[PDB]
Amino acid sequence: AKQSLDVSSDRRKARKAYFTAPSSQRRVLLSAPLSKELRAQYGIKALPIRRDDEVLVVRGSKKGQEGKISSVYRLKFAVQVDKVTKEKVNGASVPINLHPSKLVITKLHLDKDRKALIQRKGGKL
RNA sequence: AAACUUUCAACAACGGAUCUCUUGGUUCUCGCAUCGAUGAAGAACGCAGCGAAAUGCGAUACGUAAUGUGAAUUGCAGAAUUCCGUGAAUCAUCGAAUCUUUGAACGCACAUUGCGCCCCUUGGUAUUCCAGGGGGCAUGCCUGUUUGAGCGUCAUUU
């Protein structure tokens, strides 16, 4: 249970904050968990997902589907992964969204900021 | 006997009740003290690559600067190695600015995008005219400055 008075357990307020979060907060909201191998390697349970992360689906109709992220649609609260698509009847391939909470991060796109955030959260590369 | 009319069921018909939902209300509580002549609240007109609104903004116009974050924005399309970075973003923060015409609204007017006046600059062989760029000219009151007025009144005058 909550103890502090600045935390609100009101469903209406929490839902409004989620649905009207700006993109900076949606980045944290769209965090994805690392695989078991990456969790062992880094020491990080989960990270905010990025554009070039290699990701594996662990839940849904595309379980066990690998693929590098193609976009982080923060407006739609989703991520778009290459080769995870739907072939329309006209033949066009459209992206299929899915939540990063249903994914596992299998390869990190590392830059200076990602590595610094890993050390911040307690990782060691 | 049919058609027609009534009743019931099935399916199909505008209707949008019911059910479930809910970024909205409404009450209660706690904390705080912050509008404006340094131009407010409000109004008008404009600003997006493709748009007119309680979106945001002002000719620096869906915004500039500074800061934080750290890779987006996204309906479509795009300047660009913008991606191990003084750096994406309809991001957050926000202390620097810009802030059109107005509005208590301030040169005089205002059912007019109407008329002046004063400085400095530029152009027209120009201190006077015209034009352009910039900066100004409200009222009441206070303190001070300067210039005054009044046999209201003080120190010199046959």
Q: What is the DSSP letter of A102?
A: G
Q: Is the alpha carbon torsion for A39, A45, A50, A56 positive or negative? A: positive
**Beta partners for A31?**
A48
| Closest nt to residue A80, judged CA to C1' | B74
CA to C1' distance (Å), from A12 to B135: 57
Backbone angles phi and psi of A87, in degrees to 5:
-90, 110
Q: What is the phi-psi region of residue A64: left when phi exceeds 0, alpha when psi lies from -120 to 50, beta otherwise?
A: left
Method: cryo-EM
Alpha carbon distance A31, A47 (integer Å): 5
Strand B reaches within 7 A of the A29 CB: no
Given resolution (angstroms) = 2.6
- Within A 65-124, residues with CB less than 7 Å from strand B: 69, 71-76, 80, 110-117
Backbone angles phi and psi of A12, in degrees to 5:
-60, -50
